[PDB]
Design a protein around this ligand. Structure first.
Ligand SMILES: C=CC1=C(C)/C(=C/c2[nH]c(Cc3[nH]c(/C=C4\NC(=O)C(C)=C4C=C)c(C)c3CCC(=O)O)c(CCC(=O)O)c2C)NC1=O
Ligand SMILES: *[C@@H]1O[C@H](CO)[C@@H](O[C@@H]2O[C@H](CO)[C@@H](O)[C@H](O)[C@H]2NC(C)=O)[C@H](O)[C@H]1NC(C)=O
Ligand SMILES: *[C@@H]1O[C@H](CO)[C@@H](O[C@@H]2O[C@H](CO)[C@@H](O)[C@H](O)[C@H]2NC(C)=O)[C@H](O)[C@H]1NC(C)=O
Ligand SMILES: *[C@@H]1O[C@H](CO)[C@@H](O)[C@H](O)[C@H]1NC(C)=O
Ligand SMILES: *[C@@H]1O[C@H](CO)[C@@H](O)[C@H](O)[C@H]1NC(C)=O
Ligand SMILES: *[C@@H]1O[C@H](CO)[C@@H](O)[C@H](O)[C@H]1NC(C)=O
Ligand SMILES: *[C@@H]1O[C@H](CO)[C@@H](O)[C@H](O)[C@H]1NC(C)=O
Ligand SMILES: *[C@@H]1O[C@H](CO)[C@@H](O)[C@H](O)[C@H]1NC(C)=O
Ligand SMILES: *[C@@H]1O[C@H](CO)[C@@H](O)[C@H](O)[C@H]1NC(C)=O
Ligand SMILES: *[C@@H]1O[C@H](CO)[C@@H](O)[C@H](O)[C@H]1NC(C)=O
Ligand SMILES: *[C@@H]1O[C@H](CO)[C@@H](O)[C@H](O)[C@H]1NC(C)=O
Lengths: 241, 48, 321, 48, 96, 120, 48, 48, 48
């Protein structure tokens, strides 16, 4: 079917996730990996002001969303976003979560219609589906996601917390956890987000990860409480040394 | 790094050392202060 | 001292031993067999440009059943010795299957190059796993030539590790664009294998399966034919936890692992806590050797009597003699 | 000194631990001791 | 003096450093056990459980060389510190 | 010609023999190279240069720091109050005309302190 | 310290000679020197 | 530029070990010289 | 009487060999194959 229908923010020490699956306590550990730099320049979009443009996928994406009634619904990844190349789609259609890797012919302006869920103007056609997964049927919230693409594998880290403030990104430490690892093995260079059009009141932030050395302080219990970026300023360099 | 890349044809080994991370640090007390200390000591031992 | 005579004084000796004198094996109680039939006896194998991928979990990797009716002309493993494959557990098990030409079989290896390695299928430099390849001349070939297997000939770049591309756009070699039609300096990137029964050994089809797995860092569901044993606590034992061999004393722990965590490590990377594969409990592991020993003796020319000093221990707690 | 750019060498240097930190600590201790010796030898009188 | 010694603990700093370094070295020597030294892993058990007899020796030898080098460095630094403390003790004995 | 490197290229007074292509220092590092097309001689120099020191009081007291770049001017820039001391370029600390006892030794007769609106 | 059980490591350590013996000898010498220094500094009077 | 990722590591590790050994030797000799200079400075201070 | 030939002044692009050539044995010593596209060869000799 299909149909046709900047703001900057500081990264308040956000972008820390568990690097590997071991247990450590009361030990300061140094890691060398792709992280979101401290006090970075994260781009801010609204849906209240309604946009979802195609954003480049360079080396890894940090995506935060502040919402109340589930405006964000999913993402689309690919290099051309047409039937000529394989593309990945992750969607949450209010009853199931669907992850597909198909040569989708995506519509120019994808969206999900809510009156219940009545419209699926996402792609014109779907074929050559080599991977598909569906789960069992089923401002007050903030959700943080980290997407990485390494040697074909696609790694998704997730975290969620209740936040009641109005506009900005809340300041505070947050440690994401390993959620999903998928063997999609495709080329990803551009991505677009999926919005729930009602017939919104949310906002989101997008930032790019970079290779960094991080010093993480582990609490007495099994969690991380503080992080230091060895390239933010000379004092952090001295602290790392 | 404005006279280390210049017409020096690798005659000075100072640049050879500096390009490999070897650095020489200055002393805290310059010779103009050691001279004053020695002058004070000489005056004290001569007068008193 | 490396001498037959000892002068008067005090000398240091080796640490106290504390022999375990017991072996304990703990493995997940998996009773099913791995997909050996419907993977190795697959009637149709996917082409190299569209190599097939499968996930394996919750099975016992007992390859001893393969000797009766399987014969492989090429077998290699990277990152693990084959002889240990019977005493290990694999976290993520993936199997890639395809069919290629015989002389190209050597192209499936880390650091390699060529047609298959660059345009069809590539392996990472840090690859760990195994590669198996065997001749299938009497199964994939047919009289008159079998042309159902294809490969990619032209591409604008080199594939990343574990990358699959199925785009069939007309490849352009010259400056003029190819407007979806064949022509000079315009080609179809795909070609067909001309498998025939009378072809040479280098031109006969070969079936290739690559197994990828990761070891000793994550919870595992695929293990070998090893059998478990009852747990022992407050005692020094030899233990084999999901392929990890060690020796020490096991106690219950107050540590609480996250669901995705399996092992705990100290600063020196030594294992400190472990989750039981069956009882899902957390156990602390401690070393056994402890306590320096000193020998006090006069000159051996005088007498043979000696005294023994055990450091940093009581006498009441024993391990002393 | 060991690598001189070539990020692969810098990455491979990480598996060798804190040898460079120990070397730097020893050199800094020597540098501090030099100034301490100079001050001890010469700075003995309070009045100039 | 009775309250000067109670004013601050930095007056005994020359003693405190003697303790601090003696710990500072030791806690270092432990953590260098975490270095890979170019091997596949820093744990002997992983190598012994993943590799056979002929392939484990190559990694174990390099690990042994690295740990031996660390021990030699520690011993040399301890010897130098012992010489310095011996000189200080000789001065103290002469003063006494 | 297959040799990968990083550095600054300048014209050189060196004259290679016809069979020579590369020039080497004592440390075997490439120093001069003949251009494969323009047949000219080019000197290659490294880029990294100049030690950096961080001057700070106790972190329990304040977060303010000063940066000392060694063996460089401030006028030539690659540097980010400004004071040109005999030991280099100091940024983040102001200069006073008085003299006090040394608190944090900097060198070349210069010391630093944290004094009260507090600053270094 | 080098091996920590794992008899294979202990067997492979034998080809490296008597480095451990030399290390132990140096440490024992330092330990003896410490007590010698203490006795020299304090034990100077025969009568309590 | 001549070797791939898996073959360069073997050579780079040995080069790193050699350079680290050279640095360790230099640091040890510097420490010994520092001790000697400290003794000389103590003698000079006593004489002063 | 193996034949020897000298090669000079050409671009070594082996990508044209995939269409109609198949080799059962290929080995290289002193250089990784993957770097062969980004190198220059001084003296090129071929024995057949
Ligand atoms: C994109 C598809 C999607 C993904 C990749 C994902 C993870 C995810 N989200 C949630 C809770 C949970 N999850 C959601 C929904 C979301 N969080 C979102 O990013 C989105 C888009 C929704 C749906 C609108 C809600 C509204 C709640 C109710 C409070 C809470 O966040 O815990 C869980 C814990 C449930 C369990 O352990 O079985 C997980 C693994 N969830 C998804 O729906
Ligand atoms: C949400 O997505 C799932 C996955 O497509 C949908 O589940 C399918 O629903 C149709 C009937 O409408 C069934 O015929 C399919 O068998 C279902 N797929 C699977 C794998 O079971 C679901 O209907 C969608 N819900 C909404 C409201 O759109
Ligand atoms: C993955 O997709 C990107 C986008 O097309 C590819 O990048 C282009 O590749 C072609 C072929 O060399 C170049 O002509 C373009 O200049 C590239 N564009 C950009 C922005 O880089 C990329 O090559 C693909 N990855 C692989 C391994 O083929
Ligand atoms: C982010 O990018 C814009 C580009 O103009 C720049 O003005 C701004 O200073 C940058 N930093 C922040 C915190 O916005
Ligand atoms: C992909 O879709 C096309 C058109 O339906 C079809 O020809 C082809 O067989 C499918 N599979 C692959 C691997 O191309
Ligand atoms: C650490 O985790 C435990 C688990 O509940 C919790 O009780 C405790 O408050 C946390 N923090 C500290 C300092 O113990
Ligand atoms: C494949 O098929 C043959 C005959 O059906 C059988 O003998 C053989 O055991 C099978 N191979 C495996 C691995 O099961
Ligand atoms: C088998 O494993 C399960 C873990 O899910 C455990 O509950 C059960 O007790 C085990 N049974 C035996 C006989 O070990
Ligand atoms: C032996 O154990 C008892 C019980 O705690 C304790 O009093 C004693 O300190 C121990 N011996 C030594 C030398 O510490
Ligand atoms: C090609 O190389 C020759 C060197 O003999 C040079 O003279 C000429 O300028 C070069 N031409 C171009 C376009 O680079
Ligand atoms: C800065 O450059 C000028 C120009 O030669 C020079 O006079 C001065 O010595 C340089 N600064 C220092 C500290 O040498």
């Amino acid at each position: 079917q299909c149909v046709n229908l900047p703001a900057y923010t500081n990264s308040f020490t956000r972008g820390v996730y568990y690097p590997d699956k071991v247990f450590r306590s009361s030990v300061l550990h140094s890691t060398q990996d792709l992280f979101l730099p401290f006090f970075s320049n994260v781009t801010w979009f609204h849906a209240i002001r309604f946009d979802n443009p195609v954003l480049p996928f360079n080396d890894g994406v940090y995506f935060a969303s502040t919402e109340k009634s589930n405006i964000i619904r999913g993402w689309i990844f690919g290099t051309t976003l047409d039937s000529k190349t394989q593309s990945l789609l992750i969607v949450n259609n209010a009853t199931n979560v669907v992850i597909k890797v198909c040569e989708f012919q995506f519509c120019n302006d994808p969206f999900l219609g809510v009156y219940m869920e009545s419209e699926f103007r996402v792609y014109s056609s779907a074929n050559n589906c080599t991977f598909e997964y569906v789960s069992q049927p089923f401002f007050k919230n903030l959700r943080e996601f980290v997407f990485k693409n390494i040697d074909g594998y696609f790694k998704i880290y997730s975290k969620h917390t209740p936040i009641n403030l109005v506009r900005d990104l809340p300041q505070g430490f947050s440690a994401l956890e390993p959620l999903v690892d998928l063997p999609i093995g495709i080329n990803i260079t551009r991505f677009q987000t999926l919005l729930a059009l009602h017939r919104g009141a949310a906002a989101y932030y997008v930032g790019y990860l970079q290779p960094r050395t991080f010093l993480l302080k582990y609490n007495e219990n099994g969690t991380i409480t503080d992080a230091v970026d060895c390239a933010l300023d000379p004092l952090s360099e001295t602290k790392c040394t | 790094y404005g006279d280390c890349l210049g017409d020096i044809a690798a005659r000075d080994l100072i640049c050879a050392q500096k390009f490999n991370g070897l650095t020489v640090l200055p002393p805290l007390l310059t010779d103009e202060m050691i001279a004053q200390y020695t002058s004070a000591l000489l005056a004290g031992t001569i007068t008193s | 001292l490396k001498s037959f005579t000892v002068e008067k004084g005090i000398y240091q000796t080796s640490n106290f031993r504390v022999q375990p004198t017991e072996s304990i094996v703990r493995f997940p109680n998996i009773t099913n067999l791995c997909p050996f039939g419907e993977v190795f006896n697959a009637t149709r194998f996917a082409s190299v440009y569209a190599w097939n991928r499968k996930r394996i979990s919750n099975c016992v990797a007992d390859y001893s059943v393969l000797y009766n009716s399987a014969s492989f002309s090429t077998f290699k493993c990277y990152g693990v010795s084959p002889t240990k494959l019977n005493d290990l557990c694999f976290t993520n098990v993936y199997a890639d299957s395809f069919v290629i030409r015989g002389d190209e079989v050597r192209q499936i290896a880390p650091g390699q190059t060529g047609k298959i390695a660059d345009y069809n299928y590539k392996l990472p430099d840090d690859f760990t796993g195994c590669v198996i390849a065997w001749n299938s001349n009497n199964l994939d070939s047919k009289v008159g030539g079998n042309y159902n297997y294809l490969y990619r000939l032209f591409r604008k770049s080199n594939l990343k590790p574990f990358e699959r591309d199925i785009s069939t756009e007309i490849y352009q070699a010259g400056s003029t664009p190819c407007n979806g039609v064949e022509g000079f300096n315009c080609y179809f990137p795909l070609q067909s294998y001309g498998f025939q029964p009378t072809n040479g050994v280098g031109y006969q089809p070969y079936r290739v399966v690559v197994l990828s797995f990761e070891l000793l860092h994550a919870p595992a569901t695929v293990c070998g034919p090893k059998k478990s044993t009852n747990l022992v606590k407050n005692k020094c034992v030899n233990f084999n936890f999901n392929g990890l061999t060690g020796t020490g004393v096991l106690t219950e722990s107050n540590k609480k692992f996250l669901p995705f965590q399996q092992f705990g490590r100290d600063i020196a990377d030594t294992t400190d806590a472990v989750r039981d594969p069956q009882t899902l409990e957390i156990l602390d592991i401690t070393p056994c050797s402890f306590g320096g020993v000193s020998v006090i003796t006069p000159g051996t020319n005088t007498s043979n009597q000696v005294a023994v000093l055990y450091q940093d221990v009581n006498c009441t707690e024993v391990p002393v003699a | 000194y060991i690598c001189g750019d070539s990020t692969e060498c810098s990455n491979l240097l990480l598996q060798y631990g804190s040898f460079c930190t120990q070397l730097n600590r020893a050199l800094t201790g020597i540098a501090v001791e030099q100034d301490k010796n100079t001050q001890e030898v010469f700075a003995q009188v309070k009045q100039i | 003096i009775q309250d000067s010694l109670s004013s601050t603990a930095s007056a005994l700093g020359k003693l405190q450093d003697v303790v601090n370094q003696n710990a500072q070295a030791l806690n270092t020597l432990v953590k260098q056990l975490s270095s890979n030294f170019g091997a596949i892993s820093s744990v002997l058990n992983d190598i012994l459980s993943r590799l056979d007899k002929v392939e484990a020796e190559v990694q174990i030898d390099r690990l042994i060389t690295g740990r031996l080098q660390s021990l030699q460095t520690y011993v040399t630094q301890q010897l130098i510190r012992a010489a310095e403390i011996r000189a200080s003790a000789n001065l103290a004995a002469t003063k006494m | 010609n297959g040799l990968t490197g990083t550095g600054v290229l300048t014209e050189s007074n060196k004259k290679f023999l016809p069979f020579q292509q590369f020039g080497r220092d004592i440390a075997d590092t490439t120093d001069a190279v003949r251009d494969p097309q323009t047949l000219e001689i080019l000197d290659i120099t490294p880029c990294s240069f100049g030690g950096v020191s961080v001057i700070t009081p106790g972190t329990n007291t304040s977060n303010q720091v000063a940066v000392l770049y060694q063996d460089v001017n401030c006028t030539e820039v690659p540097v980010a109050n400004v004071f040109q001391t005999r030991a280099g370029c100091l940024i983040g600390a102001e200069h006073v005309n008085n003299s006090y006892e040394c608190d944090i030794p900097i060198g070349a007769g210069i010391c630093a302190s944290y004094q009260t609106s507090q600053s270094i």
